[PDB]
Design a protein around this motif. Structure first.
Motif, PDB file in Angstrom:
ATOM      1  N   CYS A 153       7.966  29.730  65.433  1.00 54.66           N
ATOM      2  CA  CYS A 153       7.705  29.069  66.700  1.00 54.66           C
ATOM      3  C   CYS A 153       6.210  29.077  67.002  1.00 54.66           C
ATOM      4  O   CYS A 153       5.696  28.068  67.439  1.00 54.66           O
ATOM      5  N   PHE A 157       5.244  25.282  67.133  1.00 53.61           N
ATOM      6  CA  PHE A 157       5.217  24.818  68.543  1.00 53.61           C
ATOM      7  C   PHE A 157       4.016  25.361  69.306  1.00 53.61           C
ATOM      8  O   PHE A 157       3.774  24.975  70.463  1.00 53.61           O
ATOM      9  N   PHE A 161       9.040  32.291  72.420  1.00 51.39           N
ATOM     10  CA  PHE A 161      10.018  32.329  73.476  1.00 51.39           C
ATOM     11  C   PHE A 161      10.346  33.763  73.829  1.00 51.39           C
ATOM     12  O   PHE A 161      10.283  34.656  72.973  1.00 51.39           O
ATOM     13  N   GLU A 167      18.052  29.872  76.914  1.00 55.23           N
ATOM     14  CA  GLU A 167      18.048  28.655  76.089  1.00 55.23           C
ATOM     15  C   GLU A 167      17.578  28.923  74.655  1.00 55.23           C
ATOM     16  O   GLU A 167      18.109  28.364  73.695  1.00 55.23           O
ATOM     17  N   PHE A 168      16.580  29.784  74.531  1.00 54.08           N
ATOM     18  CA  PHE A 168      16.211  30.328  73.245  1.00 54.08           C
ATOM     19  C   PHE A 168      17.396  31.005  72.596  1.00 54.08           C
ATOM     20  O   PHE A 168      17.790  30.663  71.473  1.00 54.08           O
ATOM     21  N   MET A 171      19.971  28.734  71.099  1.00 53.44           N
ATOM     22  CA  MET A 171      19.593  28.083  69.878  1.00 53.44           C
ATOM     23  C   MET A 171      19.729  29.100  68.731  1.00 53.44           C
ATOM     24  O   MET A 171      20.175  28.783  67.655  1.00 53.44           O
ATOM     25  N   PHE A 175      21.988  28.922  65.091  1.00 55.93           N
ATOM     26  CA  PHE A 175      21.547  29.342  63.720  1.00 55.93           C
ATOM     27  C   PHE A 175      22.476  30.393  63.089  1.00 55.93           C
ATOM     28  O   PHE A 175      22.911  30.253  61.948  1.00 55.93           O
ATOM     29  N   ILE A 214      20.393  21.752  67.790  1.00 56.10           N
ATOM     30  CA  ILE A 214      19.088  22.303  67.574  1.00 56.10           C
ATOM     31  C   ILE A 214      18.052  21.195  67.439  1.00 56.10           C
ATOM     32  O   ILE A 214      16.918  21.267  67.978  1.00 56.10           O
ATOM     33  N   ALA A 216      17.977  18.248  68.629  1.00 58.81           N
ATOM     34  CA  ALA A 216      17.671  17.566  69.913  1.00 58.81           C
ATOM     35  C   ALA A 216      16.412  18.212  70.540  1.00 58.81           C
ATOM     36  O   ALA A 216      15.460  17.487  70.953  1.00 58.81           O
ATOM     37  N   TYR A 217      16.333  19.541  70.515  1.00 57.77           N
ATOM     38  CA  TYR A 217      15.134  20.198  71.060  1.00 57.77           C
ATOM     39  C   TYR A 217      13.863  19.799  70.315  1.00 57.77           C
ATOM     40  O   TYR A 217      12.818  19.493  70.903  1.00 57.77           O
ATOM     41  N   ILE A 218      13.966  19.798  69.002  1.00 50.44           N
ATOM     42  CA  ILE A 218      12.859  19.463  68.193  1.00 50.44           C
ATOM     43  C   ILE A 218      12.373  18.037  68.507  1.00 50.44           C
ATOM     44  O   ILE A 218      11.170  17.793  68.623  1.00 50.44           O
ATOM     45  N   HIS A 220      12.578  16.331  71.241  1.00 45.24           N
ATOM     46  CA  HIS A 220      11.983  16.368  72.554  1.00 45.24           C
ATOM     47  C   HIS A 220      10.599  16.981  72.455  1.00 45.24           C
ATOM     48  O   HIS A 220       9.609  16.440  73.004  1.00 45.24           O
ATOM     49  N   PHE A 269      12.508  26.268  60.523  1.00 48.31           N
ATOM     50  CA  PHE A 269      13.124  27.178  61.455  1.00 48.31           C
ATOM     51  C   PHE A 269      14.372  27.847  60.914  1.00 48.31           C
ATOM     52  O   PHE A 269      14.522  29.016  61.040  1.00 48.31           O
TER      53      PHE A 269
HETATM   54  O1  LIG Z   1      17.779  15.853  73.974  1.00 51.60           O
HETATM   55  C1  LIG Z   1      19.160  15.671  74.351  1.00 51.60           C
HETATM   56  C2  LIG Z   1      19.694  16.937  75.027  1.00 51.60           C
HETATM   57  O2  LIG Z   1      18.721  17.479  75.979  1.00 51.60           O
HETATM   58  C3  LIG Z   1      19.271  18.581  76.754  1.00 51.60           C
HETATM   59  O3  LIG Z   1      19.220  19.970  76.442  1.00 51.60           O
HETATM   60  C4  LIG Z   1      18.028  20.706  76.340  1.00 51.60           C
HETATM   61  C5  LIG Z   1      18.398  21.918  77.172  1.00 51.60           C
HETATM   62  O4  LIG Z   1      18.728  21.513  78.494  1.00 51.60           O
HETATM   63  C6  LIG Z   1      17.248  22.883  77.164  1.00 51.60           C
HETATM   64  O5  LIG Z   1      17.668  23.968  77.981  1.00 51.60           O
HETATM   65  C7  LIG Z   1      17.021  23.306  75.706  1.00 51.60           C
HETATM   66  O6  LIG Z   1      15.990  24.295  75.652  1.00 51.60           O
HETATM   67  C8  LIG Z   1      15.852  25.011  74.398  1.00 51.60           C
HETATM   68  C9  LIG Z   1      14.637  25.917  74.485  1.00 51.60           C
HETATM   69  C10 LIG Z   1      14.504  26.914  73.340  1.00 51.60           C
HETATM   70  C11 LIG Z   1      14.506  26.193  71.985  1.00 51.60           C
HETATM   71  C12 LIG Z   1      13.969  27.085  70.878  1.00 51.60           C
HETATM   72  C13 LIG Z   1      14.515  26.869  69.452  1.00 51.60           C
HETATM   73  C14 LIG Z   1      14.590  25.381  69.046  1.00 51.60           C
HETATM   74  C15 LIG Z   1      14.291  24.982  67.590  1.00 51.60           C
HETATM   75  C16 LIG Z   1      14.434  26.101  66.593  1.00 51.60           C
HETATM   76  C17 LIG Z   1      13.529  27.239  67.025  1.00 51.60           C
HETATM   77  C18 LIG Z   1      13.761  27.791  68.442  1.00 51.60           C
HETATM   78  O7  LIG Z   1      16.744  22.149  74.895  1.00 51.60           O
HETATM   79  C19 LIG Z   1      17.780  21.164  74.900  1.00 51.60           C
HETATM   80  C20 LIG Z   1      17.446  19.977  73.993  1.00 51.60           C
HETATM   81  O8  LIG Z   1      16.182  19.391  74.344  1.00 51.60           O
HETATM   82  C21 LIG Z   1      20.515  18.208  77.519  1.00 51.60           C
HETATM   83  O9  LIG Z   1      20.945  19.380  78.220  1.00 51.60           O
HETATM   84  C22 LIG Z   1      21.572  17.892  76.492  1.00 51.60           C
HETATM   85  O10 LIG Z   1      22.802  17.611  77.148  1.00 51.60           O
HETATM   86  C23 LIG Z   1      21.098  16.719  75.646  1.00 51.60           C
HETATM   87  O11 LIG Z   1      22.082  16.554  74.635  1.00 51.60           O
END
Ligand SMILES: OC[C@H]1O[C@H](O[C@H]2[C@H](O)[C@@H](O)[C@H](OCCCCCC3CCCCC3)O[C@@H]2CO)[C@H](O)[C@@H](O)[C@@H]1O
Ligand code: HEM
Ligand SMILES: CC1(C)[C@@H]2CC[C@@]1(C)[C@H](Br)C2
Length: 464
Positions: A153, A157, A161, A167-168, A171, A175, A214, A216-218, A220, A269
């Motif tokens: 991370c 990034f 975290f 939320e961490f 995820m 894994f 997983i 989806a976060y990446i 974003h 990751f």
């Molecule tokens: O991009 C589409 C999605 O976005 C949302 O969820 C967020 C959550 O609301 C949000 O709480 C979440 O946060 C995660 C933070 C920690 C991530 C860390 C890990 C991620 C990658 C591998 C290493 C570590 O990330 C998600 C994905 O971005 C919506 O809640 C989902 O319903 C939707 O499907």
């Protein structure tokens, strides 16, 4: 002239009826008894060549890297990765992604922390967390994942975290569950019969889902970085990649695509977190079962580092017993008994066999790690496997838990730093206890497939 020998297959079923129900590795080890170190097994529809022992594995991956350097599929995750990202790529994509990933997992920005400093800081955050656990029981998985994830991370990034971040942890749960499912009996069966089984419900679908969550976060995070990207000052691995992307944008065939970005990142990751984490989990279960070894490590820490000063990579050279114990943890824990599938990239002769282009090859790294010529009593945990009579470190060419040759684990350096620093920093500050007496500790893996995964267990960290 032909493929390596092996059990005679049936149409459709391959060598299903000759397999051992305890799994793929156990099946293969039985074939080796009969056929030797080079043999063919028909996993459902296809032939797969197994190479065993360090000599044959090194012959293939090192002496014949021009032929054996391709990547095969893991049926439980191929429908997600689809040949994107460095782990699952081939050909020029692999070349590009490998060079990119090696560079950016090594060299960071203008005045950014070394890998060592990043691990040392994470280790201080860990020992503060363990101090705040007040000797409570826990299953340490979440923390072992936290600290290893947090290293990647920081590179990818530009941040870490907090261990309290739900939320961490969510995820990290994904894994953990995914590696288990992949390594499960279903996932091993799915390797044989994915063509059939993929049409039904099963854990393949759950793995796909987990991976997408997983990813989806990446995605974003990639969007956020693109929005604040300063070309003059890249912050992290993502910016660096975005830069290349911008540079090659007039090439429709650029490998610096968004799918490679997401899935390469996810790859780093997944491999960065779950491997080292699983090794630490086994490592501490082993410390609970063999408290004399942990006491002995602690003595060496005392004598070499002392109680106060944070362990540092320089300390390795002077701590052969501790390095031996970590080697032995890695040997015994046998993370990826079958390594990661390869596939021949050209017709190759191998020990008088002809292995055609595109044939899948499993290098059975477990056979090297349990080789009785290099390790007396290979099924037992014993750090002396890696020491000479004088107590000096005794490395061996059989120790190949990261594989060999072109596809050798690109995170080897980082994982060894992590194992050493995390392990010694914890032992420096804490001794371990649990409700299970050492004689009763069961080391039988909870799963044993692509990954060997230890059972859950409770532990306390007692402040010294
Ligand atoms: O991009 C589409 C999605 O976005 C949302 O969820 C967020 C959550 O609301 C949000 O709480 C979440 O946060 C995660 C933070 C920690 C991530 C860390 C890990 C991620 C990658 C591998 C290493 C570590 O990330 C998600 C994905 O971005 C919506 O809640 C989902 O319903 C939707 O499907
Ligand atoms: C205990 C820790 C680890 C072990 C035992 C391990 C083991 C392996 C093995 C066996 C392979 C397959 C090599 C082959 O295909 O023959 C591999 C590949 C890989 N490892 Fe690791 N690994 C570990 C840690 C890590 C870490 C910490 C990272 C990232 C920082 C990482 C990133 C990768 C990548 C990207 C590949 C794919 C390499 C390629 O295909 O080119 N690994 N690892
Ligand atoms: C390194 C890994 C991510 C781990 C072991 C092999 C893998 C490619 C699969 Br996705 C799970």
């Amino acid at each position: 002239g032909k493929l390596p020998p092996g059990p005679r297959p049936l149409p459709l079923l391959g060598n299903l009826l000759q397999m051992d129900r305890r799994g793929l590795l156990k099946s293969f080890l039985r074939f080796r008894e009969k056929y030797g170190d080079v043999f063919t097994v028909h996993l459902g529809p296809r032939p797969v060549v197994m190479l065993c022992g360090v000599e044959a594995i090194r012959e293939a991956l090192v002496d014949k890297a021009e032929a054996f350097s391709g990547r095969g599929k893991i049926a439980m995750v191929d429908p997600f990765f689809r040949g994107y990202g460095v782990i699952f790529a081939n050909g020029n994509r692999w070349k590009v992604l490998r060079r990119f990933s090696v560079t950016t997992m090594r060299d960071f920005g203008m005045g950014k922390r070394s890998v060592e400093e990043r691990i040392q800081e994470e280790a201080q955050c860990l020992i503060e967390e363990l101090r705040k656990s007040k000797g409570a029981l826990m299953d340490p998985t979440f923390l072992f994942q936290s600290i290893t994830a947090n290293i990647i991370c920081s590179i990818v990034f530009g941040k870490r975290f907090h261990y309290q971040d739900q939320e961490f942890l969510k995820m990290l749960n994904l894994f953990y569950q995914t590696f288990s499912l992949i390594s499960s009996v279903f996932g091993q069966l799915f390797e044989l019969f994915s063509g059939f089984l993929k049409h039904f419900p099963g854990a393949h679908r759950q793995v796909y889902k987990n991976l997408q969550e997983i990813n989806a976060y990446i995605g974003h995070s990639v969007e956020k970085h693109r929005e604040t990207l300063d070309p003059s000052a890249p912050r992290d691995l993502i910016d660096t990649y975005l830069l290349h992307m911008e540079k090659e944008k007039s090439n429709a065939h650029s490998e610096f695509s968004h799918q490679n970005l997401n899935l390469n990142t996810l790859s780093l990751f997944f491999a960065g977190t779950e491997t080292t984490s699983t090794t630490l989990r086994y490592g501490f279960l082993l410390m609970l079962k063999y408290p004399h070894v942990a006491e002995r490590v602690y003595r060496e820490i005392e004598q070499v580092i002392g109680p106060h000063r944070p362990p540092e990579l320089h300390d390795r050279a002077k701590m052969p017993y501790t390095e031996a114990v970590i080697y032995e943890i890695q040997r015994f824990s046998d993370l990826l008994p079958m390594g990661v599938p390869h596939i021949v990239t050209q017709h190759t002769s191998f020990r008088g066999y002809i292995i055609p282009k595109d044939t899948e090859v499993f290098l059975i790294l477990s056979t090297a790690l349990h080789d009785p010529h290099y390790f007396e009593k290979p099924d037992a945990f014993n750090p002396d496997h890696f020491l000479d009579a004088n107590g000096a470190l005794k490395k061996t060419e059989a120790f190949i838990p990261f594989s060999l040759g072109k596809r050798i684990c690109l995170g080897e350096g980082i994982a060894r730093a992590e194992l050493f620093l995390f392990f010694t920093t914890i032992l420096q500050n804490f001794s371990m206890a649990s409700p299970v007496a050492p004689e009763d500790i069961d080391l039988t893996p909870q799963e044993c497939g692509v990954g060997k995964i230890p059972p859950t267990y409770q532990i306390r960290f007692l402040p010294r």
